[PDB]
6-PHOSPHO-BETA-D glycosidase (Streptococcus pyogenes), 463 residues
Amino acid sequence: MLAFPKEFWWGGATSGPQSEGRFAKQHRNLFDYWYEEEPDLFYDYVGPDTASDAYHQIESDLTLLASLGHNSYRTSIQWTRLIDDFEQATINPDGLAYYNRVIDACLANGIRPVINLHHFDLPIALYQAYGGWESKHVVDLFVAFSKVCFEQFGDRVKDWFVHNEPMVVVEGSYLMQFHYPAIVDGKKAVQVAYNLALATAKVIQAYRRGPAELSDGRIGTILNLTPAYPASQSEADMAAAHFAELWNNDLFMEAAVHGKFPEELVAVLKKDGVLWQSTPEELALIAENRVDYLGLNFYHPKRVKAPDAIPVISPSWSPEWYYDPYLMPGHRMNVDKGWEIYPEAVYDIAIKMRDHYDNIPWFLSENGVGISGEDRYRDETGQIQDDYRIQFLKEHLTYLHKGIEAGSNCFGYHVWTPIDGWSWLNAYKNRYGLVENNIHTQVRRPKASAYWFKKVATHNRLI
Ligand SMILES: *[C@@H]1[C@H](O)[C@@H](O)[C@H](O)[C@@H](COP(=O)(O)O)[C@H]1O
Ligand SMILES: [Cl-]
């Protein structure tokens, strides 16, 4: 009854750090380091040394996902696995052989490989040596890494993404304490945000300069366009939502798609004394090197209100000077996670793409629901009966269909996550998979939602 466009992408998304394990990985990323130093910050003390064992099981995993109707698979290449000497971007031979296994197994199974270059996994040595994303030299080393990827894999990978949710890195590392170095420094946050956007444009330049047979595909970035719904229509609450959009959405969207930063945001940052350092050459690189397409992530809505308190001084600049989170009485909620469920937001994102971002191509690159204690839902056969996940995916997909019918140029849907993976500080507390992973034996077992999504992907339709 709800039919999707021809050649719609169906599959799911993961990342190198959350799936691979550290098996044969030369360097530590920020999270690997963090787990080494403070394991008790991680649920059940599970770090990323093994994660979901994709280092060993990628081939058998893609075979399973092919049998479950997936035509596409998004993961990430780890800078910390592929590169030996960061300053020269020399190649670790085992990492190269590893990403060649991943990509070749994708194609052998008829799965389009979709490759992200950064998913919260800066090398710790670049943080220690230079301040990480605070450094424009680090940005250059990221570019050199991206060039290795395009040269080595671009004959077979035609679908590239520079970052996953760069504002999450900015917030995690420099505002809200959920990535390492977990410091609170707005001036740094703002410069990191500029540097991530500049890195996006430089990687795009590098991709497009590659040999023609390695540069004929598409390159984008993965962003959030989650609306910041105002608590009310008061002037105050609207101005709160307005600023929350400027920061959380517009900064990276305007730079990715239109090659400019939003002027209003710039005036706020300048007034507050925290505007990034830029050069005219960097700004022209950004204007000239914009995305072919986007991934847009959605997995819960955000609401905001006018700030409850105006501090006479703050410890550091924060976007939350201009808004607070708001909880809407009567919202639908996922109790394990403390997150509102509001699938209508997918339609709103679709309409925004249509009307404000020239309807360029985009896909919903991460959509899923995470639950603990899924043991409780196994039936007689031992299969997890995750009808809550079927229902969640079905609703969000229904609103994606509504957006495509209204004219939004959406070309795909990726479930977070094909197989249970390691979610950072929460490790395996909450499971998002269509397919269960036993984290002690690394044995997989499809859940009911895997067979439901198989049907949807294979018939190219819902209901
Ligand atoms: C999106 C993100 O890209 C992915 O890495 C995370 O695993 C998921 C789920 O988050 P939690 O594990 O915090 O629930 C999204 O945040
Ligand atoms: Cl983002």
